[PDB]
Amino acid sequence: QKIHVGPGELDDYYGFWSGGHQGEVRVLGVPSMRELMRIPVFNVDSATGWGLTNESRHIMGDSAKFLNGDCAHPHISMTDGKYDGKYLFINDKANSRVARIRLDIMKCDKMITVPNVQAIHGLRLQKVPHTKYVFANAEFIIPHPNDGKVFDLQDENSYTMYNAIDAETMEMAFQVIVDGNLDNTDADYTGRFAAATCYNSEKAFDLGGMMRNERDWVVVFDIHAVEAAVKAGDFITLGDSKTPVLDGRKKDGKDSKFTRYVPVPKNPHGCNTSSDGKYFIAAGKLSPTCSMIAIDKLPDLFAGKLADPRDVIVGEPELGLGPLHTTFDGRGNAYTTLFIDSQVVKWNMEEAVRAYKGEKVNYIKQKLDVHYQPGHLHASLCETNEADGKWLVALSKFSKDRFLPVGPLHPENDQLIDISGDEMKLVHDGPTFAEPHDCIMARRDQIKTKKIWDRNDPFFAPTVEMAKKDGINLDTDNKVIRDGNKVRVYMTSMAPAFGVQEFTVKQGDEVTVTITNIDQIEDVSHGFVVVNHGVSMEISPQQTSSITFVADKPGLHWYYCSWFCHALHMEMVGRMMVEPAWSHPQ
Amino acid sequence: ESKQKIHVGPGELDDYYGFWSGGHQGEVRVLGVPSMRELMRIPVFNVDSATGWGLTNESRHIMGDSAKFLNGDCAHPHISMTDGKYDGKYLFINDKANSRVARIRLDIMKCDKMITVPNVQAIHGLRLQKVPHTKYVFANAEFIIPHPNDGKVFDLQDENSYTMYNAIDAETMEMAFQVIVDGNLDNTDADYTGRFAAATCYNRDWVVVFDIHAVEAAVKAGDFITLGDSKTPVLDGRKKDGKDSKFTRYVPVPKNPHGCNTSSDGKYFIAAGKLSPTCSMIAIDKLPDLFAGKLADPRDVIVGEPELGLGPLHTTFDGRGNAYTTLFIDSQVVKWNMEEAVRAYKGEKVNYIKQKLDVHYQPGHLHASLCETNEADGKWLVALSKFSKDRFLPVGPLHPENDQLIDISGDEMKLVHDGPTFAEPHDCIMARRDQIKTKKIWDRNDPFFAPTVEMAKKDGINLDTDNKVIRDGNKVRVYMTSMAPAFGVQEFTVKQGDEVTVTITNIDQIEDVSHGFVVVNHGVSMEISPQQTSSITFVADKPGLHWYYCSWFCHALHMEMVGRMMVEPA
Ligand code: CUA
Ligand code: CUA
Ligand SMILES: [Ca+2]
Ligand SMILES: [Cl-]
Ligand SMILES: [Cl-]
Ligand code: NA
Ligand code: NA
Ligand SMILES: [Zn+2]
């Protein structure tokens, strides 16, 4: 299998890496493991202006005030259990958000703050019939309402919630109150069932208290029952949020219609659906096991045809110390990270099932040493029924001496492993910044990108509407619109010239500069920087972008095109002249 | 033969550090060479969610008032030198967007100082004194502006409209002096003695040469002015009625010249012709006669002007006598022999061109290993090309820069790797592995957080041991140690509206056990490495219980390393 991508050769897969604590999404080529693009999401990006432009801040809403995010879980939308290449979704634990990225323009186009929750961590997509819902875990128990009167996690109104976001509208669909808390989550291959691990069944805040129970659980959601209750209006609302809220807690030992609690040891973490649709597989973490939940036994479980919730477990292989996460080659094998043993263990799922029934069989096929302390891992197309068993990435936390020293901070070691055969083979150590934690791969033919924006693209449609109120045709106009103490500059740009090369304002004026790149050639990006005003953005071919700033300094102030666009790139400059406040009314 | 191993397999280490400009994104990146893998990101002019740079009090103190800016535009990274060789102390980098120079300490891989250059706009070209050491950082301000720039005069041809050449004291990161010039400044470099520096310039254009010794003598005697509210000594290096300054000479060079590169034997300032398909070679050994008025014509210091190809932009050196120049239009790197060019300029029939290698596509800068030092080793070359076209998978409307690694160890250049990079790094610098010595554990006395140690002292806090909440009006100062997997303060209570500062000291002593600190839904994030103190300030404007958690994976029980901030309603 081709391991190295030479000058002139192209990668075979796209890889979408979480940006970890840094807050972006990164596009890599696989197997070269080189970063091809950065997609700003929860970070403020100086290069493109994401977080500074009006278009990006409009998408971020009120959360545009935050300069940080904490990503972990990137996933690609699906149709009939295969990637369809339309959207990527990612979580923000730091400020409780979910973001959607459009894979044709490789930009975040929608973002939502999940109401009435703290810390959006685990995130996974419905597989079948398509990604109608984005499922997202809120990790931490909070009071409801969280108004400062009650702080006790054991109060009857202190809880966290499972969250479902409409993937296409990026509005909330519903929320399910659960017992305990939520860690990771996955979905079945029918649309009926989703599942989440819980590590805090104790609802504690101290470390010992969170580890008290021998078993926490994976909570299983009957989404069909949830949708039925919403359509019937059997729900409540919290605060000023109109999101339907359903109660999935046990009340005095009796189950709700919406949930079932399957005892699983211990502080389990990973929650992974096998590519054949047979199992929710939970990684035991503090327990040296994984637990295998038979999805075809869930209808019976929710119908009361089983006596004990444990009866849906058909395997609990002992695997090694600190199992965290599992992935699949599509050949019947599972691959699980062992954080403490520092390995990836390859095991046969159907043989583990037989061992649970008492048959002595060695389901463990191979243990590969990794370097070191692996968290999550990802096999190519593992979240689809097209799981191809070619590439595996294990994302290890402590890189130690695997790379040159670079001061007190260390990179994550994202190691590429060849799993096309019976023997796992380590082929590449990829260092990455701010702990990506997890990633997702797609074949080259599953991603189709645009090189030239459409003029009606929704990403800047609000800006087009603003332009229209000023009577502006953005494709042609080079005009300075004045409006009180607001100035709206509209210009085309075509390398190597700004359509407006100078304009004059009053000190204190609020200046909006809107640029429409009317070059129609691939890869002629322009930039726009106003010197010493903290203003910077990118404008790709046929895009409109805009940015607003206060002309708070009198005098002449240069602006320039930041992105190398033309042999005369260095002459693509202009001047803003700011008349001093003392020559104007006060 | 060019035969070097290009593959760094698992368990093997790179041979060089590469320091990449972060381009329009504003950071510095540390790469391993020859793998071309990114080992680390160093935040500088960007705000980094991961480490908290731009949010923490320590970082905002370094940035000063410019902490209000969330952007930067980097191009020119360079490493400090002693006796013409890299000494591993500091990296310096420019910010064209908000007119800054930043210093990175290579032992901790953090920006530790930053200056806004006064009375200029757009710090672009930047390079370091070589000899006897990097006393000065030299920085070009690109754009001509009025002086003062108070909105009375906007005319760029006015007598008081100009730009200036800037010298920053490398060790103090305070301004040393500024020299007014004629024209706009592009790129700059320094000689191997400390007397001379030079910059490409325009409005045939020129390479202006600076007699730094003469500038220093005038500062010592007090023959300077100051501008506005900056105490920086300002010297006038302009021509006046055809009469030369004592500080400058203008050497005519065609045409809109761009790169300005000192050969590693110290013989030449080489200016890349750009619009002229040439480079111009200025003989540094003739500059003293030039300034002494002993030459008849400024063009007499030009000892070579080889024709190389269309659009020469930048030049580097293998230490074997060859120069390598990017041809932007022809889209190549051309290898040529400098002494043969000098003889050709005299009329000898000698072909100084050795090889042209196609690169992909439109190269700007290039960099050979140790090229800025008299130890230039002729092993690796990186050419940084702007239009990557079909060399990588398509990724939407934006495109990566193509930073191509070329083996120059033998007679023939060989292209070995295409490295895609984000936001047009533009230029880079390499150092031998043994030229860089980094700390894995912080020193408790490090100046990076010494202002925070000082704050702790006024509160009576021993940062190494204490877990205490200090109340001070509507200000709350939490101090805590952290040791995986537990925050030393796991809960604290404040009043809605309080201004909370959380100072965390990581007292783990094992390498690479970093902790984080994130306050959910408050925009608060930072990293604390072993034996570091880091602090962050935010207002508790929302009543109720608000979780904080450790963001950096520190322990098997990392997920459980959490705490609770309780906010009582107003
Ligand atoms: Cu437009 Cu460079
Ligand atoms: Cu401390 Cu994770
Ligand atoms: Ca537990
Ligand atoms: Cl998972
Ligand atoms: Cl240069
Ligand atoms: Na939204
Ligand atoms: Na400073
Ligand atoms: Zn440059």
Swiss-Prot record, chain B:
PTM comment: Predicted to be exported by the Tat system. The position of the signal peptide cleavage has not been experimentally proven.
Region (COX2-like), start-end ranges: 474-570
HAMAP family linked: NosZ
Annotated InterPro entries: CcO_II-like_C (IPR002429), Copper_CuA (IPR001505), Cupredoxin (IPR008972), N2O_reductase_N (IPR011045), N2OR_C (IPR034205), NO_Rdtase (IPR023644), Nos_propeller (IPR041114), NOS_propeller_2 (IPR041142)
Residues holding Cu cation Z2: A75, H124
PANTHER family: CYTOCHROME C OXIDASE SUBUNIT II, NITROUS-OXIDE REDUCTASE
Name of this protein: Nitrous-oxide reductase
Subunit structure: Homodimer.
GO molecular function, one term: nitrous-oxide reductase activity
Residues binding Ca(2+) 1, per UniProt: K386, E401
Positions contributing to Cu cation Z4 binding: H426
Known role: Nitrous-oxide reductase is part of a bacterial respiratory system which is activated under anaerobic conditions in the presence of nitrate or nitrous oxide.
Positions of Cu cation A1 binding: H515, C550, C554, M561
NCBIfam families membership: nitrous_NosZ_RR (TIGR04244), TAT_signal_seq (TIGR01409)
Reactions the enzyme catalyzes: N2 + 2 Fe(III)-[cytochrome c] + H2O = nitrous oxide + 2 Fe(II)-[cytochrome c] + 2 H(+)
EC number: 1.7.2.4
Cofactor note: Binds 2 calcium ions per subunit. Binds 6 Cu cations. Each subunit contains 2 copper centers; Cu(A) (binuclear) and Cu(Z) (tetranuclear). Cu(Z) is thought to be the site of nitrous oxide reduction.
Pfam families registered for this protein in UniProt: COX2, nos_propeller, nos_propeller_2
Cofactor: Ca(2+); Cu cation
Keyword Heme: no
Entry's family note: Belongs to the NosZ family. In the C-terminal section; belongs to the cytochrome c oxidase subunit 2 family.
